[PDB]
């Protein structure tokens, strides 16, 4: 039970399931993106999106963190913490 | 080789001196040699002792 | 502008290790550290723990068990031969037996 | 109880309800479409005062809420097996060896493995050598009388370290 | 016997005349020696008992207590050094020859023919455990553990001494067999009360009982390792010891005057297994178990069957191995952290992951694992005491339940879950812990085997 | 490119002392077994005859096992 996870597989799959989601576009869809600046989307449907995260993933993040996301690349990196991602 | 240490053969000498005077003593003790009803033979065959 | 004392910071704690990462139980001496273990070992179970197993794994009859086995064969085994019930009651001979009066 | 204020807020308490009656809702629902309908007929009957420009109603219609919740929550809420009341709860803590050790090994097995020692040896030196100045110097620097925060700054001054960093750094990778 | 008490003499001027780095080995080579010398004695046979001199005997209750004894010396030994091996070596010659002096006065308590002579070498017993517990006590209450120590002892052990003379200038001399023999039955007068109530409780401060129990914890928590082992193993039992040989005289009124002490026994037994469930302070957690264990041998001992007074003899030298490997371990997580409490040091099933093992053996010997020697002991003493009334089962069994729960709450508390990680100074395991704990287990194990040798005089 | 660092707490000591304990036990555990094999297969026990007329024994010649 150990598939080796990769910076550009996780990349990919938060993308995936972010250009998945109903609301925003495929063209402005960065990674440097904001929750709140340009996406322009609210705190509401973004803690439904941390929902997504927790639920494709298979872990829980804390309410300490979910307030302070708000973008994909940061996203990134906190899965990158919670799971030490080097082979 | 004694004389190269004699603090390590105390307690054997010790020991083989306390066995020895248990021996005298119990020999000093030496009533009811075989006055019992119930361990009692005559001196056989050769010299006169059943324990020492 | 007082202390009470005048003596060491104390302690200094020695790792025994980190000067001899080979070492044995008790301080850096480290020749009689090894002595220690040899000695500790085959005249603490190389002449006690299995000598001391042979000695006590037999020896006579301890509280005279099996002379007690054979000796009850055999007065068992005449009581049948002679009818007389086996193990007979009143073990004390009634006859050399003087109950006081009223 | 959090570490970095003294309180939550208004926002983040309605919030943590939201994700908390969403979560029982999953450990109520199977087959996720009926599921789905229920979650957004939630996430309407949150629509309906959402822009009340009052605020003791707003907590009040909270409280309400709260009644509401833990009246109709779950016996076995759908805790996931990484979390804490979970399945796991640090399942593989069999391994989770501190890194104090490992330099208390007989030279024999440092000369088994003699580069991965090389390079902790000078990641330990790389750790005193920046230990004293910098790092006590940006903590007995900053602050108030009173520290009154549990964050802490960067090395954001010119080079090395972040401070109090070895703990944060060095820990078990939690899959071993 | 003097064949034993002359080397034990003789090993005294050897630390002396012996050198730095030269007492050890002389002294720790030569007990084992003498242990080899006592466990030739093992010759004890049928009719009675065996004599060593005009003024030696050894009963069969005395030979695995006095092999228990040499035993335990050279363990001991070996384990009192690294809290005192950085002090001065004339302070540490004297703590040697103070535990040789100790031994001596042991050997001459358990090989007692006269009870007086017996009462002399007890108080004999005494004075060197004091000295060693007060020198290195190692803690700041030292001195209120030695004083409560030594006026609970002799001022219990006091009348003691008195109604042993009045025995003396009643009944002709005190011979065991002399004292058998001639036993005539004593009727219920209340000076015969008294009497068997003087002794009784001397015997009663010395177990402990559960009214007299505070003598012991301080006397175990600010004490060596090596006064510990000595204090809990070969003073409990030999108190033990002295209640089982003198309980021959006065049985025509021990039933009628043993209803309270009895009783006082057996809810003592469970207030003080629950009294170690919740303790800091995990020295002390054996120190209860003990007097949890000398509760029920002396339950075992006012009941007096020969099925209760093989199961009290076994029971005593199983608890009396088991409290001793355990203060030796609990030594060993002291010697790993300052602390002495139970919740600080913690994990320990990663690091150390045979130490690990140590404790688990110890603590299913303190379960009374089924094999081992005292769930022998508690099991005849269970077995005699539902002869002896069909309703105290309840207390023996609650008993066993709760040493289970705080027997298993000192394994999984302190080496079990977590490591605190702000430890970072412990250091593998030394190999001399390691052969202590060898010393400690193997023996068990082998009687486990054979345990035909450690059943009492009734065998 | 694919394996990586186990941290173990030590090896050394403990099985430099668990070796040391099979080998000092092992070193007159073996010679005594191949000794008193060698005498339950050549010395005797003992047999099971009774008292001869006029004649006394030792307080040895009373027992099976000839090393007891
Ligand atoms: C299980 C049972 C759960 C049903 C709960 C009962 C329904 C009660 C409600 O409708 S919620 C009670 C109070 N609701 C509020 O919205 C209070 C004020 N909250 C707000 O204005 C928020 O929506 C915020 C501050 C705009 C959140 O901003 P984020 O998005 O940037």
Redesign the pocket.
């Given at each position: 039970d150990a598939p080796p996870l990769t910076l550009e597989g996780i990349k990919d799959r938060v993308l995936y399931v972010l250009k998945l989601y109903d609301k925003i576009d495929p063209e402005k869809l960065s990674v440097n993106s904001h929750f709140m600046k340009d996406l322009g989307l609210?705190?509401?449907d973004?803690?439904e999106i941390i929902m997504a995260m927790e639920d494709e993933f298979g872990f829980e993040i804390p309410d300490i963190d979910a307030e302070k996301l708000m973008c994909p690349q940061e996203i990134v990196d906190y899965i990158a913490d919670k799971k030490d991602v080097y082979e | 080789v004694v004389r190269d240490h004699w603090i390590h053969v105390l307690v054997p000498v010790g020991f083989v001196f306390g066995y020895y005077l248990d021996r005298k003593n119990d020999e000093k003790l030496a009533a009811f040699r075989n006055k019992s009803l119930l361990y009692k033979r005559e001196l056989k065959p050769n010299e006169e002792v059943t324990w020492k | 502008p007082t202390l009470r004392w005048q003596e060491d910071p104390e302690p200094e704690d020695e790792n025994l290790y980190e000067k001899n990462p080979d070492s044995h139980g008790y301080d850096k001496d480290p020749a009689v550290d090894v002595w220690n273990m040899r000695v500790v070992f085959f005249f603490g179970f190389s002449i006690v723990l299995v000598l001391g197993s042979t000695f006590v794994a037999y020896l006579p009859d301890y509280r005279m068990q099996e002379w007690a086995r054979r000796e009850a064969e055999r007065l068992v085994k005449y009581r049948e031969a002679h009818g007389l019930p086996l193990m007979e009651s009143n073990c004390f001979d009634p006859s050399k037996i003087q109950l006081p009066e009223d | 109880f959090l570490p970095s204020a003294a309180y939550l807020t208004?926002?983040q308490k309605?919030?943590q309800?939201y994700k908390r009656?969403l979560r029982?809702?999953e450990s109520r629902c199977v087959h996720r479409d009926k599921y789905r309908y229920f979650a957004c007929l939630?996430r309407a009957?949150?629509d309906?005062?959402?822009?009340?420009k009052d605020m003791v109603k707003?907590?009040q219609?909270?409280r309400?809420?709260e009644k509401?919740?833990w009246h109709?929550?779950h016996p076995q809420p759908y805790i996931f097996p990484e979390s804490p009341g979970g399945t796991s709860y640090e399942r593989y803590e069999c391994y989770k060896v501190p890194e104090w050790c490992l330099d208390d090994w007989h030279p024999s097995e440092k000369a088994m493995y003699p580069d991965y020692f090389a390079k902790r040896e000078q990641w330990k030196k790389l750790r005193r050598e920046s230990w004293e100045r910098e790092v006590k110097q940006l903590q007995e620097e900053t602050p108030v009388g009173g520290p009154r925060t549990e964050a802490l700054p960067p090395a954001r001054k010119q080079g090395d370290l972040p401070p109090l960093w070895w703990h944060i750094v060095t820990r078990p990778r939690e899959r071993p | 016997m003097l064949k034993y008490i002359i080397p034990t003499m003789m090993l005294m001027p050897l630390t002396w005349l012996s050198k730095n780095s030269m007492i050890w080995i002389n002294t720790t080579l030569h007990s084992l020696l003498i242990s080899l010398t006592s466990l030739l004695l093992l010759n004890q046979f049928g009719d009675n008992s065996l004599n060593f001199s005009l003024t030696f005997f050894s009963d069969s209750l005395s030979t695995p207590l006095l092999i228990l004894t040499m035993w335990l010396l050279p363990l001991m030994l070996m384990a009192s050094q690294h809290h005192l091996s950085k002090e001065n070596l004339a302070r540490k010659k004297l703590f040697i020859s103070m535990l040789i002096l100790l031994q001596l006065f042991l050997i001459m308590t358990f090989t007692a023919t006269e009870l007086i002579f017996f009462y002399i070498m007890f108080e004999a017993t005494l004075v060197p455990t004091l000295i060693i517990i007060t020198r290195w006590g190692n803690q700041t209450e030292r001195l209120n553990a030695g004083l409560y120590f030594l006026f609970y002892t002799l001022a219990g052990s006091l009348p003691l001494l008195v109604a042993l003379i009045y025995i003396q200038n009643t009944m002709g001399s005190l011979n065991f067999l002399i004292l058998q023999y001639w036993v005539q039955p004593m009727p219920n007068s209340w000076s015969n009360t008294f009497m068997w109530l003087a002794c009784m409780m001397a015997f009663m401060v010395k177990m402990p009982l559960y009214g007299l129990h505070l003598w012991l914890p301080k006397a175990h928590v600010e004490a060596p390792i090596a006064g510990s082992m000595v204090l809990a193993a070969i003073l409990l039992k030999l108190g033990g010891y002295g209640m089982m040989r003198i309980t021959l005289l006065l049985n025509p009124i021990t039933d009628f005057m043993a209803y309270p002490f009895i009783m006082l026994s057996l809810w003592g037994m469970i207030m003080t297994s629950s009294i170690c469930l919740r303790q800091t302070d995990l020295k002390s957690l054996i120190a209860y178990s003990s007097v949890s264990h000398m509760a029920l041998v002396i339950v075992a001992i006012l009941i007096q069957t020969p099925w209760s007074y093989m199961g009290a003899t076994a029971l005593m030298i199983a608890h009396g191995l088991t409290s001793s490997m355990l203060f030796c371990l609990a030594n060993s997580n002291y010697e790993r952290v300052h602390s002495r409490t139970m919740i600080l040091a913690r994990g320990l099933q990663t690091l150390l992951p045979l130490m690990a093992a140590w404790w688990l053996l110890a603590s299913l010997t303190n379960l009374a694992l089924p094999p081992s020697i005292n769930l022998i002991g508690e099991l005849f003493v269970v077995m005699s005491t539902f002869s002896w009334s069909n309703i105290t089962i309840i207390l023996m069994g609650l008993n066993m339940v709760i040493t289970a729960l705080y027997s298993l709450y000192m394994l999984i508390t302190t080496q079990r879950g977590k490591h605190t990680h702000h430890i970072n100074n412990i250091l593998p395991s030394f190999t001399r812990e390691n052969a202590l704990m060898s010393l400690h287990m193997l023996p068990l194990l082998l009687l486990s085997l054979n345990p035909k040798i450690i059943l009492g005089p009734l065998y | 490119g694919k394996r990586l660092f186990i941290i173990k707490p030590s090896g050394f000591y403990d099985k430099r002392f668990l070796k040391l304990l099979r080998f000092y036990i092992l070193l007159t555990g073996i010679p005594v077994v191949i000794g008193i094999t060698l005498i339950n297969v050549f010395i005797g026990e003992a047999e099971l005859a009774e008292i001869p007329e006029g004649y006394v024994p030792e307080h040895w010649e009373y027992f099976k096992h000839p090393i007891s």
């Open positions: 609210d705190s509401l973004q803690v | - | - | 208004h926002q309605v919030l309800l009656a029982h809702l939630l009957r949150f309906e005062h959402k822009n009340e707003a907590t219609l909270l309400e809420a509401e919740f109709g929550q | - | -």
